[PDB]
Design a binder for this molecule. Structure first.
Ligand SMILES: [Hg+2]
Ligand SMILES: [Hg+2]
Ligand SMILES: [Hg+2]
Ligand SMILES: [K+]
Ligand SMILES: [K+]
Ligand SMILES: [K+]
Lengths: 416, 416, 416
């Protein structure tokens, strides 16, 4: 038992040791800023490794999942997945707005058009490391390219390419085999990185509990943390199991239990795209879900799901707006929540989406950007919980989509 | 009939409706600059889609066309194509100079060396989205990289790679199959984009006839438009059919008629590289031209042909020079015409080459860049006609090259 | 005989003619700076061609060499190669320090951490043309990306990818075949460039002996050149042959003689990565070295070897430090030598590594950067000798590693 799953127990022990080391160093030592930065180097190296493997994995896996489906049945499955994700996103948005209004812890047109612009990039190679942005200037619109991987356009192109090569028949079989092999190789490289994972995680946690200086941020942010945690808990325990039970007449909690390893891996590494191998294995072997449904549904959810964004980034934006004593109407609150939810779409995949996404959402909404440092402190913990919620939602969606496509999966088998 | 070719009639109807809508909005409405920009968003989205597909299509198609030819016969075919293109370019240059001198509508060394520098880029990945440029500075030469796809170096590398892998025999067959499948997939994605084409075209035309403000630009630019249109018409109707009849003893106008769909598609979408599927189909099925000659000749012409550049951009440069009352000798006029013709080489492929190429040519020649906005107004129409002329020239060249290589195409068949 | 090896004799004649032309032009002509720059254009074009082919060649060849080895024997061979390179680098460092101290011709933490940071880039596409760098700022650390290919991370990823796909069995065979064909194609393109090589070399040499103005740099740099040349000569003639004779009980000088063509090609083109085809051919056919050992050892040495860096760049750094009359302890001299040796790792592959590496090492050490122009003058000659020394060291290492892995190469054959 210990040898079979030594990675998970070693990671848990590393987390505990990192928390203890961070507390002890903070209490019994006086480190300068430079030494505090040098103390977290292994965690930065681990994050660089994790970011290095996101692109090829997502691209190859998405293409493989699209091409594995028959041409005449892929539309209905995609429609079901889209409907499920839309319903979950809407419910999450409503819950987040209601909670942020009740607890009170405290141009959007260009930002909405930039999403469509980034859906269709002007260069395929440039989209791998750069993104497009526009702003008003004296009024005319001026656009430019800045650093940051454009995963939305890559996803769209991957979907189109997979659909095209899955219909060519024998003319596209070489591409199908090439991308299948590439996906397998990337999955093995991810497994290789998972061996170095725990040592980086230890220093990441130790250095996270070190940068806190005054500790009064915990006093000021108590209600904001309570709001985000309550929203995530309600979404995880009430809404998703009920939807699964409504569609699938089976015990939702047994299904959630069967994905415990994937959930804990997502909670530890704080990334959904890099948890894909564990998610695949748990869904296929523990829950007896069809491979064809899983390999197509999970890659889309690992990059598109926005149930946690609407419950974290939108709540943070509303909290920041409330901090400045700004008077907000019921229409304005909805505007901010939708803008924040839509602005960040690849947050689940990023190992620390919050650090880069907070300033992007604040700039898109048009609020003072100097208040980001107040909320960055608890991002390392709220973001990891959000990652667990997103992975659980993706697994539930995979199960639901498998349940609904019963005749399609039996017609797809008689053909072969 | 209507169902078979619904795309072309729908595109024509969209063009008519866009012209009517633009005229009506300009006459009966007062729109601000921001609203005028927001009115043309679908056209911008269509242009982004068109630009997204240029790179893979050109690269894969060019490699496939080079590799499909036998190693011992590819030299003569390439030589014939080069000679044809050189002759047509020289005739176009002479005609443009003569017309611009007669009607009078009104350092180059670094620019010429930059063409050779861009023929051999220092990085293959960087060449996909960046270009090299040099300038004098106090005198020493300083070079840097700026945005803009370097299609010249990509073409050169594609030619070399295709020639190399077409001679390896069975060792390069996997690469040949891979690039064949990639070319087919890109062609299907282009066909997919052609469905959204008409809706974007409507708003593009409607927003083009909207940005005109004073309407006195039509009074000032009457002679410049007349000169460009007369040059293009003379090249299309007199010179190219005569050359085709001289080499090929067949009716030139029947050959031109058989490519009407491709000509209209080029006139509508204002891009030659994206018209490649229609050109291939019309040349192979309507004119009974050999596939091996077509798949090699057309990709080169869609990126290298300069008969329309010498008749449009050179005429515009000479017009700008005449506007400033600059005294130009017969040597100077030739210098400007050759510099403008050589500076722009990938204009035919770009959906709106004129917008970006005008400032590049003006900077290369060394003339005031503030006069570009005067001529940008009628670019959307002169450029579309230029695109029709270029496509017709490419088709005529394909026919001529097929005619000349008669023994090579019969020796290439006895081998297989 | 003349027809078989016309390239080498033509290159030697071009070198002689270039030296004569440069001397004659310098003595009997007065050229301005702009004309001196325009005189060396063919050499710049040749260097652009050479830089264009480095990336695909190195990546494909390294992957192919890793994947060709059996999974159970690749570790010992890699360990032997690493030990050999470490021993040679240490001996070179010691010799360089001793010589620079005896003859006297006259923060590092961030630079050392940047090496590990660049070992694991955050983006695979961006690593092809950009590098990461950090600096202190008021103290916090700020990082950014600048131009320059990150070959270290590409090498690491190539090693991991080759190891992963060589164990997949039949699931990764398509990738193995693809990269084998790509390596062959790149090797043929290199052979094509070798035809234009001599004409560019002539003008490169002619323009190198032209930029010298005062000729007093030869008087001031006499001892620095003597030190570097003596170190390189001692390393080439004494240490490496002795190590080869100790491990391999065969005549070291016959082995060196059998690689004369590769040595002369490295001396002429001043690049190790582009000399790889000649090195492969000479090692496999003239010295009867196993192909499996050669195709794996040589690509690693052509990018990682640091015996010449420690003998050239470290000596130059110590000379610059001595020029400023800076008092340096025995610990400081070691610090500078190790920092300079470790900072430059891909110098052997670059056609003119010295030009870009001198300022990088000077910035990393923290010394006045205005003294680089004094030592740039003789870089074109010291660098070419360094390239010969590095190629000889790589060949000797290939021989030694082949000798040590005797049972592994006989067990790897009984399996097939
Ligand atoms: Hg934290
Ligand atoms: Hg227009
Ligand atoms: Hg020199
Ligand atoms: K995340
Ligand atoms: K065009
Ligand atoms: K070198």
């Amino acid at each position: 038992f210990l040898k079979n799953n030594w990675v998970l127990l070693s990671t848990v022990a590393a987390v505990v040791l990192g928390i203890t080391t961070g507390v002890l160093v903070r209490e019994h030592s006086n480190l300068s800023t430079l030494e505090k930065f040098y103390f977290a180097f292994p965690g930065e190296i681990l994050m660089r490794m994790l970011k290095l493997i996101i692109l090829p994995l997502i691209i190859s896996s998405m293409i493989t999942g699209v091409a594995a489906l028959d041409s005449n049945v892929s539309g209905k499955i995609g429609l079901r997945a889209v409907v499920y994700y839309f319903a979950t996103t809407l419910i999450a948005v409503i819950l987040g707005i209601v909670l942020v209004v009740s607890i009170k812890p405290g141009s959007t047109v260009d930002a909405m058009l930039d999403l469509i612009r980034n859906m269709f990039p002007e260069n395929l190679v440039q989209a791998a490391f750069q993104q497009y942005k526009t702003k008003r200037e004296e009024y005319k619109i001026v656009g430019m390219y800045s650093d940051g991987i454009n995963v939305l356009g890559l996803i769209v192109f991957a979907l189109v390419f997979g659909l095209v090569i899955g219909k060519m028949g024998e003319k596209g079989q070489i591409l199908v085999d090439f991308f299948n092999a590439l996906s397998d190789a990337t999955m093995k490289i991810v497994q290789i990185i998972m061996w170095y994972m725990p040592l980086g995680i230890l220093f990441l946690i130790a250095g996270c509990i070190i940068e806190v200086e005054d500790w009064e941020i915990f006093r000021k942010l108590g209600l904001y943390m309570a709001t985000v945690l309550t929203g995530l808990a309600i979404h995880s325990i009430v809404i998703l199991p009920l939807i699964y039970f409504i569609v699938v007449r089976k015990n939702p909690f047994r299904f959630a239990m069967g994905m415990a390893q994937a959930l804990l891996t997502a909670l530890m590494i704080s990334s959904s795209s890099a948890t894909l191998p564990v998610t695949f294995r748990c869904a296929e072997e523990n829950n007896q879900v069809d491979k064809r449904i899983t390999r197509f549904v999970l890659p889309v959810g690992a990059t598109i799901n926005m149930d946690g964004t609407a419950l974290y980034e939108a709540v943070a934006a509303v909290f920041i707006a409330q901090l400045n004593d700004l008077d907000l109407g019921i229409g304005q609150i909805i505007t901010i929540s939708i803008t924040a939810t839509s602005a960040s779409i690849g947050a689940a995949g990023v190992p620390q989406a919050g650090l880069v996404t907070m300033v992007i959402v604040l700039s898109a909404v048009g609020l003072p950007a100097e208040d980001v440092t107040l909320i960055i402190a608890v991002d390392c913990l709220l973001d990891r919980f959000r990652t667990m919620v997103n992975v659980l939602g993706d697994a539930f969606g995979t199960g639901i989509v498998e349940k609904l496509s019963k005749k399609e999966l039996e017609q797809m088998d008689v053909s072969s």
